Design a protein around this ligand. Structure first.
Ligand SMILES: *[C@@]12=NC3=[C]C([C])=C([C])[C]=C3N([C][C]([O])[C]([O])[C]([O])[C]OP([O])([O])=O)C1=NC(=O)[N]C2=O
Length: 144
């Protein structure tokens, strides 16, 4: 699956379609593929939960479930795994994308990878970056 211009935006993100069974990934940027080690054909049509593994905090996963069910934004940190099983920390931001009547049409997820759980200045700078990125992608996705 060749990258669309959207997917060549130089940021780590995915877009899912909550109309399709299990809210699957339909767009995944090249940097997301580089991070996770999967090809685009391997992850399209799958729910993002395949990135989770034994050390993933399930309490945090439930925070994300609740955000999606209530169609609201969330920002959390959790451990995720690459295809080859390497752990990374994921500073993750979710937000819905709404149409001209205000209904959610897609979800946008922005991921910032790190080697540790961040706090204080590193957390603040991380969250500044992922929120700004989410806004950029919301604009890009308006024409999908
Ligand atoms: C995945 N990012 C991500 C991006 C979007 C836009 C969405 C909608 C979800 C994710 N997930 C969360 C996952 O798909 C799921 O929502 C949760 O596991 C909670 O639901 P379940 O049914 O499992 O309780 C992401 N999960 C990750 O682990 N990493 C991300 O990058």
């Amino acid at each position: 699956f060749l990258a669309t211009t959207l997917e060549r935006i130089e940021k780590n993100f995915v877009i899912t379609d909550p109309r399709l069974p299990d809210n699957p990934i339909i767009f995944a940027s090249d940097s997301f593929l580089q991070l996770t080690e999967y090809s685009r054909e391997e992850i399209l049509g799958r729910n993002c939960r395949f990135l989770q593994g034994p050390e993933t905090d399930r309490a945090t996963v439930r925070k994300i479930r609740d955000a999606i069910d209530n169609q609201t934004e969330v920002t959390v940190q959790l451990i995720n795994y690459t295809k080859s099983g390497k752990k990374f920390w994921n500073l993750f931001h979710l937000q819905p994308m709404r149409d001209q009547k205000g209904d959610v049409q897609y979800f946008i997820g922005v991921q910032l990878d790190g080697t540790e759980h961040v706090r204080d200045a590193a957390e603040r700078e991380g969250v500044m970056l992922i929120k700004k990125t989410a806004e950029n992608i919301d604009e890009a996705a308006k024409e999908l």
